[PDB]
């Protein structure tokens, strides 16, 4: 299982 999230302001 592979889970990913990213934010760029």
Q: What is the DSSP string of the chain?
A: ---------
> How many angstroms separate the first and last alpha carbons of the chain?
28
For 5, what's the count of Cα atoms within 13 Å in the CB-facing half-sphere? 0
What contacts 3, CB < 8 A, 6 or more positions away? none
DSSP state of 7: -
Tokens representing residue 4 in the block:
């990913």
Tokens representing residue 6 in the block:
């990213």
């Amino acid at each position: 299982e592979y889970s990913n999230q990213n934010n760029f302001v």
